[PDB]
């Protein structure tokens, strides 16, 4: 199966009120396993999954050092960006970044990522070919020239091709009892009258992992797009996810409606009906 190691970061300036806030997190697939939050007294990179707790003191010291170096650099970048865009000294601004590697089914680098945003807008991204940059505007073009001068794309690619994958492999092994398990959705359909001639069927998918899922309603085998509401997949808070979709139907015609669920944990797509 395919897997990913990803780090995400948010840096928020607080002009006049001290240092920016830095919150960084790391994920393997859809599971968070580390964090760094600068607004602690002595901030440390910390475990947020059980299977990473076994890493020794040198691991946590090195990751705390990397977090602090990144924060120093994010701080510099927030200042630089304020200048690039000729913005006031007074407003708060946000820098976000993400980076990581995908391990393919053949055990090799499938994809690499390195992307940044300023105040919620795409700023600069590493090209899918991992050789060059794509800049969103003239400010990012300045960054691009600097990163080209220091051959940063090649240096980051070396991280992606080596250590990123080495660490991902290690996490996947150490955490294999949870990371490498596809938990299927528990599914059910509820029924709630809307009027004396209509009812709502709500199709539930609960407790599934990973997050990727599809859930649709059909009437007589036909995809339903009217009289319907779907919620986006959302975390349950126990490491699993939830999703539901509801459709309003004519009373007495419930059995014409079918809910269709597909997930890695389901060997076949599920077809479900209300069961009175």
């Amino acid at each position: 199966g395919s897997h990913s190691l990803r780090y995400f970061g948010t840096a928020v300036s607080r002009p006049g009120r001290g240092e920016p806030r830095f919150i960084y997190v790391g994920y393997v697939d859809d599971t968070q396993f580390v964090r760094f939050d600068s607004d602690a007294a002595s901030p440390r990179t910390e475990p947020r999954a059980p299977w990473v707790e076994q890493e020794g003191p040198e691991y946590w010291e090195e990751e705390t050092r990397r977090a602090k170096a990144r924060a120093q650099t994010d701080r510099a970048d927030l200042r630089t960006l304020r200048g690039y865009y000729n913005q006031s000294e007074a407003g708060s601004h946000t820098l976000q970044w993400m980076a990581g590697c995908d391990l393919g089914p053949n055990g090799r680098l499938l994809r690499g990522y390195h992307q940044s945003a300023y105040d919620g807008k795409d700023y600069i991204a590493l090209n899918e070919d991992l050789r060059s940059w794509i800049a969103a505007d003239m400010a990012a073009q300045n960054t691009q020239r600097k990163w080209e001068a220091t051959r940063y794309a090649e240096r980051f690619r070396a991280y992606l091709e080596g250590p990123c994958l080495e660490w991902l492999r290690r996490y996947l092994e150490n955490g294999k009892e949870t990371l490498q398990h596809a938990d299927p959705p528990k599914t059910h359909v509820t029924h709630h009258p809307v009027s004396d001639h209509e009812a709502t069927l709500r199709c539930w998918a609960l407790g599934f992992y990973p997050a990727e899922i599809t859930l649709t309603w059909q009437r007589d085998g036909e995809e339903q797009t009217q009289d319907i509401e779907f919620v986006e997949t959302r975390p349950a808070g126990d490491g699993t996810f939830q999703k539901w979709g509801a459709v309003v139907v004519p009373s007495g015609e419930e059995q014409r409606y079918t809910c269709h669920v597909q997930h890695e944990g389901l060997p076949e797509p599920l077809t479900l009906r209300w069961e009175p």
Binding site: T73, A76, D77, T80, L81, L95, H114, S116, Y123, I124, T143, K146, W147, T150, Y152, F156
Partner: peptide
């Protein structure tokens, strides 16, 4: 990165 190494500085934006």
């Amino acid at each position: 990165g190494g500085a934006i």
